[PDB]
């Protein structure tokens, strides 16, 4: 009964045309509870979930100078990296970062993280023992040795170990029925004929929450997984997702294979037959 | 709740 | 660290006066206090980054500018009994550090009369 | 935010321990401090804590308990220098405002 806390950021230059766009948004599982956008109307840090709504004008003033602070270092970070990688200014480029904390079945801490990218790939990241810094090439150095005088690293450790695990057991409790909750997946089969000699049968896992799930075919052993069409999961819009695999079998070995579902609201692996 | 020390690249 | 000049000062009534501060720690935010008996240290003005400013508590009274990053001046233009008191100024990193600490400067003793 | 400070002058004989108390409002404050203003000088940083529990580096031990949004300080063998008014300070972010408690005078009698 694992849980985690994760905020993601997005910087991106806007050449011609005045400040580059800031998104933030902060989530508990699968489940978002804070926004900030730059185009928005009111220009501080928003409610995504009801559990987040009664906690206070000192948590919203706080969240909303935070998320100011960050989008002014990001938005003097799109120029400096420019300037490292000497591009022209006629050009869109894009930061992202992410940070957050995992807890496990006792939410007693269990891993901390803080990633940075620039134009789709990794730039800078801090090391899972919250001391190190791994550096992407030879202009992330620059980063790493000033962030290593700058003392960094120390103060994400002190964050992630302590501050975001303490306030997303807040959370936890918060939003006990919306976060706590665990939904097992509504599953069924469809058979598709194509002609006389060619069928695709179509697992189906829907509503379920939280999204981790694998689906898997086989045909009491064998690994059919490795040629099925498996779609990414997919949000249904009212907090639970969905998530279906198919292959193409020649008819008569239909139904000697099996679909498997794994999710964390079932107690034991389903097995559908045909 | 947010990080309170973000630092320039 | 923070060095911050003069270290007394008496001005009359109406005299303007302009307490010079500054940091050589590459520090983005610096602030003003006022330290008096009965409330203890009271922020005036503080600036976030060069050309950003800000009113504190008790801002009345004082001027502030900040064209560089290095110094940070108190102006008072018209003076006044009643801005009788220590005044000490502070610095922490910004975005330029993740020290959280800050540090005051060796402080000025002004007084004034009608 | 406030800070809320032990009390009026704690007097304590050359050796004793002193031990000063310090008490938040802000539950979202993620940085601590404290500080040792010497009469007719300046606040000078003396402890800083960003984690919640037990800091005893030097001379000096401090005690963060976050979840009852208290700080701690306790100056073992006590030397009659340490006479000055401690002042705690709390903070949220690095853009955050500091602040203190209103500072609680120590009298370290020889």
């Known amino acids: 009964g694992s849980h985690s806390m994760r905020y993601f950021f997005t910087s991106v230059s806007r050449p011609g045309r005045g400040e580059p766009r800031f998104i933030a948004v902060g989530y508990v599982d699968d489940t978002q509870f804070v926004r900030f956008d730059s185009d928005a109307a009111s220009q501080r840090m928003e409610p995504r979930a009801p559990w987040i709504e009664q906690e206070g004008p000192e948590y919203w003033d706080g969240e909303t100078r935070k998320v100011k602070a960050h989008s002014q270092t990001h938005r003097v970070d799109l120029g400096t990296l420019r300037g490292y990688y000497n591009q022209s200014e006629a050009g869109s480029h894009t930061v992202q970062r992410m940070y957050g904390c995992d807890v496990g079945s006792d939410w007693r801490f269990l891993r901390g993280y803080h990633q940075y990218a620039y134009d789709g790939k990794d730039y800078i990241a801090l090391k899972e023992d919250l001391r190190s810094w791994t550096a992407a090439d030879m202009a992330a150095q620059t980063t790493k040795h000033k962030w290593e005088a700058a003392h960094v690293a120390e103060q994400l450790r002190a964050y992630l170990e302590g501050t975001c695990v303490e306030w997303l057991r807040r959370y936890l409790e918060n939003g006990k029925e919306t976060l706590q909750r665990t939904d097992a997946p509504k599953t069924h089969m469809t058979h598709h004929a194509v002609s006389d000699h060619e069928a695709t049968l179509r697992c189906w896992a829907l509503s379920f929450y939280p999204a981790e799930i694998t689906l898997t075919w086989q045909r009491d052993g064998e690994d059919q997984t490795q040629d099925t069409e498996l779609v990414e999961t997919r949000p249904a819009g009212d907090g639970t997702f969905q998530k279906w695999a198919a292959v193409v079998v020649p008819s008569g070995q239909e139904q000697r294979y099996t679909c498997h579902v794994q999710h964390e609201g079932l107690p034991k692996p389903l097995t559908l037959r045909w | 709740l947010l990080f309170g020390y973000p630092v320039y690249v | 660290g923070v060095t911050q000049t003069p270290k007394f000062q008496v001005l009359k009534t109406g005299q303007s006066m302009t307490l010079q501060c500054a940091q050589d720690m590459n520090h983005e935010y610096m602030s003003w206090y006022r330290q008096d008996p009965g409330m203890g240290l009271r922020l005036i003005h503080y600036?976030?980054?060069?050309?950003?400013?800000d009113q504190g508590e008790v801002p009345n009274g004082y001027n502030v500018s900040r064209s560089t990053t290095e110094d940070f001046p108190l102006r008072l233009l018209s003076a006044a009994p009643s801005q009788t008191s220590v005044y000490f100024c502070?610095?922490?990193?910004?975005?330029?550090?993740?020290?959280?600490?800050?540090?005051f400067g060796p402080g000025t003793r002004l007084t004034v009369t009608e | 935010k406030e800070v809320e400070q032990n009390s009026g002058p704690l007097s304590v004989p050359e050796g004793a321990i002193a031990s000063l108390n310090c008490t938040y409002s802000d539950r979202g404050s993620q940085s601590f401090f404290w500080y040792r203003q010497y009469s007719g000088k300046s606040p000078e940083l003396i402890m800083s804590?960003?984690?919640?529990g037990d800091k005893e580096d030097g001379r000096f031990t401090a005690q963060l308990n976050k979840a009852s949004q208290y700080v701690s300080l306790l100056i073992r063998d006590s030397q009659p220098s340490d006479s000055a008014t401690y002042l705690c300070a709390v903070t949220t972010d690095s853009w955050g405002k500091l602040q203190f408690g209103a500072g609680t005078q120590v009298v370290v009698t020889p």
């Open positions: 600036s976030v980054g060069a050309g950003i400013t």
């Open positions: 502070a610095s922490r990193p910004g975005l330029a550090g993740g020290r959280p600490e800050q540090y």
């Open positions: 804590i960003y984690s919640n």
